[PDB]
Design an enzyme around this catalytic site. Structure first.
Site, mmCIF file in Angstrom:
data_model
loop_
_atom_site.group_PDB
_atom_site.id
_atom_site.type_symbol
_atom_site.label_atom_id
_atom_site.label_comp_id
_atom_site.label_asym_id
_atom_site.label_seq_id
_atom_site.Cartn_x
_atom_site.Cartn_y
_atom_site.Cartn_z
ATOM 1 N N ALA D 12 0.820 -1.207 0.000
ATOM 2 C CA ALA D 12 0.000 0.000 0.000
ATOM 3 C C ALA D 12 0.856 1.260 0.000
ATOM 4 C CB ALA D 12 -0.943 -0.005 1.201
ATOM 5 N N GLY D 146 3.527 -3.543 6.260
ATOM 6 C CA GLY D 146 3.232 -2.198 6.721
ATOM 7 C C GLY D 146 3.115 -2.076 8.224
ATOM 8 N N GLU D 254 6.463 23.387 12.167
ATOM 9 C CA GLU D 254 5.551 24.153 13.010
ATOM 10 C C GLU D 254 4.197 23.474 13.171
ATOM 11 O OE1 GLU D 254 5.346 28.059 11.538
ATOM 12 O OE2 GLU D 254 4.176 27.643 9.747
HETATM 13 N N1 LIG Z 1 -6.374 2.399 -0.675
HETATM 14 C C1 LIG Z 1 -5.505 1.429 -0.945
HETATM 15 N N2 LIG Z 1 -5.334 0.389 -0.053
HETATM 16 C C2 LIG Z 1 -4.455 -0.607 -0.314
HETATM 17 C C3 LIG Z 1 -3.717 -0.589 -1.486
HETATM 18 N N3 LIG Z 1 -2.932 -1.683 -1.492
HETATM 19 C C4 LIG Z 1 -3.155 -2.385 -0.359
HETATM 20 N N4 LIG Z 1 -4.105 -1.738 0.378
HETATM 21 C C5 LIG Z 1 -4.632 -2.151 1.695
HETATM 22 O O1 LIG Z 1 -3.638 -2.819 2.452
HETATM 23 C C6 LIG Z 1 -4.252 -3.766 3.302
HETATM 24 C C7 LIG Z 1 -3.310 -4.908 3.661
HETATM 25 O O2 LIG Z 1 -1.983 -4.600 3.302
HETATM 26 P P1 LIG Z 1 -1.418 -5.164 1.906
HETATM 27 O O3 LIG Z 1 -0.966 -4.038 1.013
HETATM 28 O O4 LIG Z 1 -2.480 -6.008 1.242
HETATM 29 O O5 LIG Z 1 -0.155 -6.087 2.269
HETATM 30 P P2 LIG Z 1 1.188 -5.433 2.855
HETATM 31 O O6 LIG Z 1 0.864 -4.261 3.745
HETATM 32 O O7 LIG Z 1 2.082 -5.021 1.713
HETATM 33 O O8 LIG Z 1 1.869 -6.630 3.679
HETATM 34 P P3 LIG Z 1 2.452 -7.911 2.899
HETATM 35 O O9 LIG Z 1 1.386 -8.524 2.028
HETATM 36 O O10 LIG Z 1 2.924 -8.936 3.896
HETATM 37 O O11 LIG Z 1 3.606 -7.471 2.033
HETATM 38 C C8 LIG Z 1 -5.462 -4.257 2.530
HETATM 39 O O12 LIG Z 1 -6.544 -4.471 3.404
HETATM 40 C C9 LIG Z 1 -5.782 -3.137 1.559
HETATM 41 O O13 LIG Z 1 -6.995 -2.522 1.921
HETATM 42 C C10 LIG Z 1 -3.879 0.453 -2.391
HETATM 43 O O14 LIG Z 1 -3.228 0.476 -3.432
HETATM 44 N N5 LIG Z 1 -4.776 1.462 -2.116
#
Ligand SMILES: Nc1nc2c(ncn2[C@@H]2O[C@H](COP(=O)(O)OP(=O)(O)OP(=O)(O)O)[C@@H](O)[C@H]2O)c(=O)[nH]1
Ligand SMILES: Nc1nc2c(ncn2[C@@H]2O[C@H](COP(=O)(O)OP(=O)(O)O)[C@@H](O)[C@H]2O)c(=O)[nH]1
Ligand SMILES: [Mg+2]
Lengths: 40, 145, 94, 439, 427
Positions: D12, D146, D254
């Site tokens: 994400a 994340g 700030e």
């Molecule tokens: N708005 C938005 N949400 C995202 C996007 N990509 C992932 N998410 C959110 O991220 C959440 C979980 O994290 P993920 O991106 O799927 O996986 P990660 O955080 O990369 O962790 P790993 O899969 O172990 O690498 C999901 O529930 C999605 O809702 C995106 O491009 N846009």
């Protein structure tokens, strides 16, 4: 001077094609000993 | 630029399949182009771009069909990827650290990653005698031999 | 290349200078290496629907139709196609 | 020469940053190749791109951003995309196997292997900067990367770098729309270290921006390409003052001090306006007095929460484009006269304003309209207690029967850490009740 | 980048796997010889997962072919895509299993596994980083039930930290084609519940009902029956070979879907199925696909999910689609079927979306289900065991080669331990 894009705006609109690109020891004389190649 | 105003509730062809865009440009894309079905038809109703006085009781032909407009007017109308790239392209390379597979790259040796990937992409796209030498040295020297 | 005239199916052997059966008894496709079509699209007979009555025989309970709608066209090698001296693409092998 | 560092971890974080650098190349007129064009001239300073880029003596600009992920499947899109010739080839760091939506697989076992390569690039970047100001880390709560790779990176960076403010833009789990099953687990484990090493963590979600994409934009079916282009404009409206000039500019240091009243209360919400399509913008008149009343609607917050139940704590308005300061002033005094918008008694002055002299930009092939101005709202409020009440109701219903626990235990996490993180949010839910009551 | 080793043993496991390598070779555009012939370049960046490069631009698979009979090994070489395999991977004995578990696990299967595991560890040592194992077998035979538990026991004792994809064809009540199926079924679940991260259960009578209701095939032979399993086989791991938009690899399905160490038996599925006639009448959309998932007639096991509950559901979408319509439609189905999904776990459903749909279709989706209704599959096998164990019938063929009566009571106790967990959590 000015960019190419500015030169495009000045010919389609005002009908003028103005493109001026304005810009802003000798050897000592021979003494008389040896050869002219050796003394040189 | 013909399109439909947002909030329109009529039918549009392939409206239910296009994704990720507003109703405005989805409808604007769909109106002009036919693809699988027929284009919007040739007769498009939607989306626009007397010698007699009144009171006369005589007969005027085909005047009972014309309506919604006055007697003189109805009388008037009654009378009337680097793989797809070329080998000569300088962009046929992969940057350092690319995990993705490149064919015919494992067999090359002694070259950097961009040069080796470029070569892989191009490949995927495609004396006499001791006695004679040291003898008769008198006539023909070792330099002559 | 064997070709049984009763079934119009081809099995292939090999002669080593044997490895037995090179290709199994099947209808050899003619044009290109064919893609595997999605299942249910290769039926010999077409059916509108089965019988809405719950009691029915499974092999007997089908109403066939008059329209060949989703019929996939396939060309198969037969005895008329191949003669002495013609190239044959055996699943990609010319 | 006022600098920032942007790190994108997880999927994400990286995928949003693909849409962040969409914008900055065309704001400043930089081609994806990194070479400025020779024919067309854009309005942009030689110190305007110095916030986010770096001039290399061959006349090629390079971004100041570090891309890390433990799984090569998303980074390889960028290496073979339209921006291959943009980034540094060492800046994109590639792992072997992902975190599998596990916290302990990015913080204990796989995340320890490449943490020396991640921090050494930050060391290499910061020594090139003349004056540093802060960090902009992009990640998400619910993921395993994340939550995992954010946790150890910002706890070693706070040790290395002392008093630099950190600005994290994280995706909040929505109340109903949720993808993974371990979301109540991976969200709690992050916040045990956000409270000590993060000074301001701006928060957005997925369900609120889905519904904003439906009413305002009139999009029937939004992808993830639509959401990242909207979050990409808020971050370009926060870092606008370091790149452009205006009436009263806001500094990155700030608004770290205007928005954090207590050391544990630092979770604001983002809001952008006017978010509209191309058919309605030309019909309406979008004045200063109405783009700021659009921000205060209950339906225009980009987090699925009701701001009416809580009372606001400290606000911050960030304007852009053609705006005069007097129209802003009458637009604030008309808000404090409203009865629904309730502020706390102990903070009579809560609003803060910042004005820039550059209108918003629009990407070719985009969805947003061309408007003369924009406003960004960054609101600290007590309404997030109800947002974290329902997520703690998710935790105890799953912890009561110890479901999915043994995947965490099998990597290195003790069982005792689960109880300590829950007692941290036990206190944090009482803090909004302790702060929110009027003396 | 992530490396998967594929194994296959037994007659039912050999023929499905030979139908597996036929689908994915066309997916990545590989000729039957082993030459790449495709249209798009996205099929080539991740080709190391299943295939290994040979010299001269020729590709070979990562498969180990083992049987105690030479009969079916000649059939795999004789298949349409049979020439691609490695002749060094063809290890086999000469004495038939005789539909005997002891003749594959203790007596004659103990001499072949020395050379079987040597070929497996030769392929995995050449890989840079291994991910997991995929094995195809049947629970009712003498080879696939005997040697299936033998190889997964020896692999896990030497690769501890991996993931196991055991794709087992379960016995069927009406389509039972051996009299000793309750003996061969109970003797393999003692090692499957202990030493398998996830098992996908396939019966034969639900695949015929799918072939007769959804597909309306007049003559559903084995050639078309194994292709139904082959699509769900290749659909579960699409996020490791193709680019996507919400990626989810094999261990991510391990974390989301296994809440307890011995509840991991999954019901599979496929989602764009249709008959030949109604291709032009079906509207292919996500709300049409999502109704096709949770239909009672579209899963591949002989269990009615209405007779139980649901622990965790994951479905992997493919193709170009938005994510609001995916996320709302897999929230509408949870709220409407509130009684079926459990209350002590919130957000039972996990979604995943890729970017490359399969050839010949605009989009596709693979459905995987973990439910409490799988206790009915293990209840009938257990009560079929008791009626044969009471009179000691067909027992001297087992006890005459090393096995004893005391092993039979322990395996039936493990089914009673396994089936009790699903009913305990149901209420
Ligand atoms: N708005 C938005 N949400 C995202 C996007 N990509 C992932 N998410 C959110 O991220 C959440 C979980 O994290 P993920 O991106 O799927 O996986 P990660 O955080 O990369 O962790 P790993 O899969 O172990 O690498 C999901 O529930 C999605 O809702 C995106 O491009 N846009
Ligand atoms: N779906 C399917 N099932 C098969 C196939 N071949 C055998 N079976 C099933 O396998 C069961 C018997 O397993 P068996 O062949 O004796 O196992 P083995 O002795 O270890 O090879 C039968 O009930 C069949 O229904 C096949 O090609 N497809
Ligand atoms: Mg990831």
């Amino acid at each position: 001077d000015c960019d190419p894009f500015t030169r495009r705006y000045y010919k389609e609109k005002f009908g003028i094609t103005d493109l001026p690109r304005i810009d802003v020891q000798e050897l000592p004389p021979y003494n008389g000993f040896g050869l002219v190649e050796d003394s040189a | 630029n013909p399109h439909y105003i947002p909030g329109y509730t009529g039918h549009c062809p392939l409206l239910r399949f296009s994704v990720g865009q507003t109703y405005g440009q989805v409808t604007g894309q769909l109106l002009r182009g036919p693809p699988g079905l027929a284009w919007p038809p040739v007769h498009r109703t939607l989306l626009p771009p007397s010698s007699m006085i009144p009171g006369y009781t005589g007969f005027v032909p085909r005047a009972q069909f014309i309506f919604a407009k006055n007697c003189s007017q109805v009388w008037a109308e009654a009378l009337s990827s680097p793989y797809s790239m070329d080998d000569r392209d300088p962009r046929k390379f992969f940057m350092s650290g690319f995990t993705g597979y490149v064919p015919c790259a494992r067999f090359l040796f002694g070259s950097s990653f961009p040069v080796l990937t470029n070569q892989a992409l191009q490949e995927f796209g495609q004396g006499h005698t001791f006695g004679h030498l040291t003898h008769d040295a008198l006539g023909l020297s070792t330099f002559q031999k | 290349l064997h070709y049984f005239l009763c079934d119009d199916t081809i099995e292939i052997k090999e002669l080593l200078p044997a490895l037995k059966m090179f290709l199994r008894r099947s209808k050899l496709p003619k044009n290109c290496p064919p893609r595997v079509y999605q299942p249910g699209q290769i039926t010999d007979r077409a059916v509108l629907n089965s019988y809405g009555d719950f009691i029915k025989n499974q092999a007997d309970g089908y109403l066939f139709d008059r329209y060949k709608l989703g019929k996939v066209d396939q060309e198969f090698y037969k005895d008329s196609d191949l003669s002495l001296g013609v190239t044959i693409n055996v699943w990609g092998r010319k | 020469m006022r600098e920032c560092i942007s790190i994108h971890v997880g999927q994400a974080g990286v995928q949003i940053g693909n849409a962040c650098w969409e914008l900055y190349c065309l704001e400043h007129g930089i081609q994806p190749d990194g070479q400025m064009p020779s024919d067309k001239t854009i309005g942009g300073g030689d110190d305007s791109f110095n916030t986010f880029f770096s001039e290399t003596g061959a006349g090629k600009h390079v971004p100041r951003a570090v891309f890390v992920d433990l799984e090569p499947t998303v980074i390889d899109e960028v290496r073979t995309g339209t921006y291959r010739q943009l980034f540094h080839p060492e800046q994109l760091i590639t792992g072997k196997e992902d975190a599998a939506n596990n916290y302990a697989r990015g913080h204990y076992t796989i995340g320890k292997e490449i943490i020396d390569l991640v921090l050494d690039r930050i060391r290499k970047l910061a020594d090139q900067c003349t004056g540093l100001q802060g960090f902009l880390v992009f990640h998400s709560f619910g993921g395993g990367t994340g939550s995992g790779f954010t946790s150890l990176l910002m706890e070693r960076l706070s040790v290395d770098y002392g008093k630099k403010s950190k600005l994290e833009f994280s995706i909040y789990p929505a109340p109903q729309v949720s993808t993974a099953v371990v979301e109540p687990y991976n969200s709690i484990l992050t916040t045990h270290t956000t409270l000590e090493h993060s000074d301001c963590a701006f928060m957005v979600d997925n369900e609120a921006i889905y519904d904003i994409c439906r009413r305002n934009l009139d999009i029937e079916r939004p992808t993830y390409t639509n959401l990242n282009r909207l979050i990409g404009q808020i971050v370009s409206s926060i870092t606008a003052s370091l790149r452009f000039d205006g009436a009263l500019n806001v500094d990155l240091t700030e608004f770290q001090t205007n928005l954090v009243p207590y050391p544990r209360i630092h979770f604001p919400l983002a809001t952008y306006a006017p978010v509209i399509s191309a058919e309605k913008a030309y019909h309406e008149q979008l004045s200063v007095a109405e783009i700021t009343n659009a921000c205060f609607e209950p339906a225009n917050q980009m987090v699925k929460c009701d701001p009416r139940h809580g009372k606001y704590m400290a606000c911050c308005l960030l304007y852009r484009g053609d705006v005069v300061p007097k129209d802003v002033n009458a637009a604030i005094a008309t808000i404090k006269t409203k009865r629904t918008i309730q502020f706390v008694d102990w903070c009579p002055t809560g609003f803060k304003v910042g004005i820039n002299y550059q209108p918003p930009t629009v990407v070719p092939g985009g969805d947003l309209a061309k408007v003369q101005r924009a406003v960004c709202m960054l609101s600290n409020t007590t309404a997030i207690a109800e947002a974290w009440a329902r997520l703690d109701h998710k935790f105890d219903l799953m912890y009561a029967k110890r479901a999915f626990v043994h995947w965490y235990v099998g990597e290195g996490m003790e069982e005792g850490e689960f109880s300590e993180a829950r007692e941290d949010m036990a206190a944090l839910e009482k803090d909004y009740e302790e702060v929110g009551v009027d003396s | 980048m992530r490396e998967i080793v594929h194994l296959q043993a037994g007659q039912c496991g050999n023929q499905i796997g030979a139908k597996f390598w036929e689908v994915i070779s066309d997916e990545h555009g590989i000729d039957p010889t082993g030459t790449y012939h495709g249209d798009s370049d996205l099929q080539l960046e991740r080709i190391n997962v299943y295939y290994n490069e040979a010299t001269g631009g020729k590709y070979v698979p990562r498969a180990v072919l083992v049987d105690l009979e030479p009969g079916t090994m000649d059939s795999v070489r004789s298949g349409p895509f049979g020439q691609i395999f490695r002749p060094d991977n063809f290890v086999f004995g000469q004495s038939g299993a005789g539909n005997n578990w002891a003749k594959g696990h203790y007596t004659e299967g103990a001499e072949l596994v020395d050379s079987v595991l040597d070929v497996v560890r030769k392929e995995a040592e050449s890989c840079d980083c291994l991910q997991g194992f995929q094995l195809t077998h049947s629970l009712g035979g003498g080879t696939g039930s005997g040697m299936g538990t033998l190889l997964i026991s020896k692999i896990r004792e030497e690769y501890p930290d991996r993931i196991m994809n055991t794709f087992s064809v379960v016995p069927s009540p009406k389509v039972s084609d051996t009299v000793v199926e309750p003996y061969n079924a109970t003797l393999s679940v003692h090692q499957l519940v202990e030493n398998t991260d996830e098992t996908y259960c396939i019966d034969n009578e639900a695949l015929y009902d799918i072939c007769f209701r959804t597909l309306k095939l007049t003559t559903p032979t084995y050639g078309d029956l194994n292709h139904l399993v082959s699509a769900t086989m290749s659909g579960v791991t699409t996020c490791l070979r193709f680019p996507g938009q919400l990626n989810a690899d094999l261990r991510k399905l391990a974390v989301n879907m296994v809440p307890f160490p011995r509840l991991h038996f999954f019901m599979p599925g496929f989602a764009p199925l249709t008959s030949r006639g109604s291709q032009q009448y079906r509207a292919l959309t996500v709300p049409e696909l999502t109704q096709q998932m949770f239909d009672a007639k579209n899963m591949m096991a002989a269990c009615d999910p209405r007779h139980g509950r649901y622990l965790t559901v994951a479905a992997v979408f493919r193709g170009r689609m938005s994510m609001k319509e995916v996320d709302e439609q897999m929230l509408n189905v949870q709220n409407k079927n509130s009684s079926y999904f459990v209350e002590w776990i919130p957000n039972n459903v996990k979604t995943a979306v890729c970017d490359i749909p399969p050839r010949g279709l605009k989009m596709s989706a693979t459905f995987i289900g973990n439910s409490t209704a799988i206790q009915e599959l293990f209840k009938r096998i257990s009560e079929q065991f008791t009626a044969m164990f009471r009179r000691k019938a067909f027992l001297h063929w087992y006890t005459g080669e090393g096995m004893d009566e005391m092993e039979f009571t322990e395996a039936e106790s493990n089914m009673n331990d396994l089936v009790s967990e699903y009913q305990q959590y149901q209420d």
